[PDB]
Design a protein around this ligand. Structure first.
Ligand SMILES: CCCC(=O)OC[C@H](COP(=O)(O)O)OC(=O)CCC
Length: 501
C-alpha cells in the first residue's frame, strides 16, 4: 500500500536530521491504532467530547481519556514513561497514574517510572519533584516499594525559552498515548469552560520510537542534574537516574508488529540539549522574508537557524506534511501565530508552503482558537492574535511575493482558503459565558495522512513530539469524528478575508 505522504516526509527528515533517526525521529511499519472493542474510532481521544452540546454536561471524552490512561498503566509489566508540561500530573490524571500503578504491582510487576515536566523560567513549580514523589509514594501505599520512580522538572534554555512540551504516556515501549492534552486538572477537569483537545493512542513499534525519544530527553536530564538551575530530580528507593530505561527494556529484538499502520514518530530537542546534528548535510536557502509587523528580540531559531532545524526535525516534518498535500489540507490549532516579541510572529516557510498550496488550487482550512481567548502565556486555549486577519493578511502577503500581482493573490486566497475560529456547537460561547478554547495540534492532508502531537504550528522552541499516520481508513475516521464536525460548527465563525466575495 503506497505511502506517498510519509515518503516525502521521510526524505525531509533524512535530509534534515540523519543522525537523529532512531532517536528523535523514526519511521516504522506494523502499528495499530489502539481502539477498544466495538469502538473502532476509539483510538482518537477527543476532549471534552461534546460535539453539538453547548452545555457539555456528560463529558464522556474526558472520561474515556482518563480510563484509557489508567488501563494502559495497569497493563505495565516493566516501564511507565510520562512527560508533560508542568505541573506534574494532578487531579484525575494523578488518579490514573496511581490506580494503574497499584494494579500493575498487584499483578506482580515491579515497574520503573519516569515522569518529566518542562518548566518555563517564569513558572513557579508549586509541587517540586521531591514533593510530588513523596505524594505519589503516599498515594501508592504498600505498592511504593515495588515502584522505581524518577521525577524531574527541567529547563533546557533560559534565554531561548526552551523546556519540555511533549505530552506522552509510553508503557513497556509497547503502547503510547500522545497529543496536546496536558495532564493538569485545571484545563480539562475542574472547570465549567473546558479546553477542546485531542490525543491519539497506538501500540507497536512507534511506541518504542516514542520511548527512544524520551530516552534522549532523560539522557540530557540525568546529566544536567549537576546544574540545579536546569534540572530538579528526585528518585525513590535510593534508585539511580534511569537515562536509558526505554533502551534497556527494548533489548536487541526489534519491536513486534501489532497492526498494519505505517507511522512516522518525530520530535525536536528545542534549544540547549544539542546544538546541531553534526552528521547532517542539511543546507537550506532560509527565507529572506521580513515582517514590518514585528522583529524578534531573540535570535530567530524558527526562521534563521540551520542548526536548530537539524535537532528539531518536527519543524520540517510538519512543513513537508503540508507540502505533500495534493488536494486539501486541514489545520486545526490553538494558533498559527506566536506572540511577537519575544518569538517570531510566524513560521515563514510554513506560510510560504500554505500560500503555494492556495496558488495551486489546493484547498486550505485553518481553524484556530477564538481571538476572544485572552490568557497568560501558559494558558491552554489562549490566542496570540487579535483577529483572524493576521492569518489571511499574512497569506495574502506571501502570495504576492510568490505570484507577482495582487489579484492573482486574491483568486488563490478567496477561492481556496477557509479560515474560522473554533466552535464545537451552535453556541458562540460556552453556556458559562466564556468562549471556546482550542488546543489541538493537528494537521490532516488529502484524507490520508495526519499529525497528532504536541508541536504547535506557531513558533516555539520547546521539546515536542508526535505521530504522523498515513492510512486512508484512519483519516476517514478522523474526518468523520473530528474534522467534519469541527467545520460544521466553526464555519459559523468563518472569516472573509479583506478583498473577497
Ligand atoms: C508557563 C508558560 C510557558 C509554557 O507553558 O510553555 C508552553 C506554552 C504553552 O503551550 P500550549 O499549551 O499553548 O501548546 O507555550 C509557550 O508559549 C512557549 C513559548 C514561550
Amino acid at each position: 500500500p503506497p505511502t506517498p505522504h510519509l515518503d516525502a516526509i521521510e526524505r525531509s527528515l533524512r535530509d534534515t536530521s540523519p543522525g537523529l533517526e532512531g532517536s528523535v525521529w523514526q519511521r516504522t511499519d506494523g502499528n495499530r491504532l489502539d481502539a477498544p472493542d466495538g469502538d473502532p474510532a476509539g483510538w482518537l481521544l477527543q476532549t471534552p467530547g461534546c460535539w453539538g452540546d453547548a452545555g457539555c454536561k456528560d463529558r464522556a471524552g474526558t472520561r474515556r481519556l482518563l480510563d484509557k490512561m489508567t488501563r494502559n498503566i495497569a497493563d505495565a509489566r516493566h516501564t511507565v514513561d510520562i512527560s508533560s508540561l508542568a505541573p506534574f500530573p494532578n487531579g484525575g490524571f494523578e488518579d490514573a497514574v496511581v490506580d494503574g500503578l497499584k494494579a500493575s504491582v498487584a499483578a506482580g510487576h515491579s515497574p520503573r517510572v519516569r515522569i518529566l515536566v518542562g518548566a518555563a523560567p517564569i513558572y513557579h513549580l508549586n509541587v517540586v519533584p521531591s514533593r510530588y514523589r513523596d505524594e505519589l509514594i503516599g498515594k501508592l501505599g504498600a505498592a511504593a516499594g515495588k515502584v522505581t520512580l524518577n521525577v524531574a522538572s527541567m529547563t533546557t534554555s533560559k534565554t531561548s525559552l526552551s523546556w519540555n512540551h511533549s505530552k506522552l504516556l509510553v508503557v513497556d515501549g509497547k503502547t503510547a498515548i500522545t497529543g496536546g492534552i496536558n495532564t493538569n486538572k485545571d484545563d480539562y477537569l475542574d472547570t465549567a469552560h473546558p479546553v477542546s483537545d485531542v490525543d491519539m493512542a497506538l501500540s507497536g513499534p512507534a511506541a518504542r520510537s516514542a520511548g527512544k525519544y524520551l530516552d534522549t530527553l532523560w539522557d540530557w536530564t540525568c546529566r544536567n542534574a549537576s546544574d540545579p538551575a536546569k534540572v530538579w530530580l528526585a528518585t525513590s528507593n535510593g534508585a539511580s537516574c534511569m537515562p536509558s530505561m526505554e533502551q534497556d527494556e527494548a533489548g536487541s529484538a526489534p519491536a513486534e508488529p501489532t497492526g498494519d499502520v505505517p507511522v512516522i514518530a518525530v520530535g525536536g530537542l528545542g534549544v540547549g540539549i544539542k546544538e546541531s546534528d553534526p552528521s547532517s548535510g542539511y543546507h537550506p536557502d532560509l527565507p529572506t522574508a521580513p515582517d514590518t509587523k514585528c522583529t524578534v528580540g531573540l535570535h530567530d531559531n524558527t526562521n534563521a537557524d540551520r542548526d536548530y532545524d537539524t535537532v528539531n526535525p518536527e519543524e520540517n516534518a510538519l512543513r513537508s506534511l503540508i507540502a505533500s498535500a495534493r488536494s486539501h489540507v486541514e489545520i486545526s490549532q490553538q494558533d498559527l501565530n506566536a506572540t511577537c516579541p519575544p518569538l517570531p510572529r510566524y513560521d515563514i516557510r510554513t506560510y510560504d508552503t500554505l500560500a503555494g498550496k492556495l496558488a495551486a488550487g489546493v484547498k486550505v482550512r485553518i481553524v484556530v482558537s477564538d481571538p476572544a481567548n485572552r490568557g497568560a502565556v501558559g494558558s491552554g486555549g489562549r490566542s496570540q492574535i487579535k483577529s483572524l486577519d493576521e492569518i489571511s493578511d499574512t497569506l495574502r502577503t506571501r502570495l504576492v511575493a510568490l505570484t507577482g500581482d495582487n489579484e492573482k493573490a486574491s483568486r488563490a486566497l478567496c477561492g481556496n482558503l477557509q479560515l474560522a475560529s473554533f466552535r464545537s456547537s451552535d453556541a458562540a460561547k460556552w453556556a458559562d459565558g466564556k468562549p471556546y478554547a482550542l488546543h489541538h495540534k493537528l494537521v490532516s492532508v488529502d484524507d490520508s495522512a495526519f499529525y497528532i502531537g504536541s508541536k504547535n504550528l506557531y513558533p516555539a522552541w520547546l521539546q515536542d513530539f508526535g505521530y504522523i499516520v498515513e492510512s486512508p481508513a484512519a483519516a476517514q475516521q478522523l474526518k468523520t469524528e473530528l474534522l467534519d464536525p469541527e467545520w460544521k460548527y466553526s464555519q459559523q465563525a468563518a472569516a472573509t478575508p479583506a478583498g473577497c466575495p
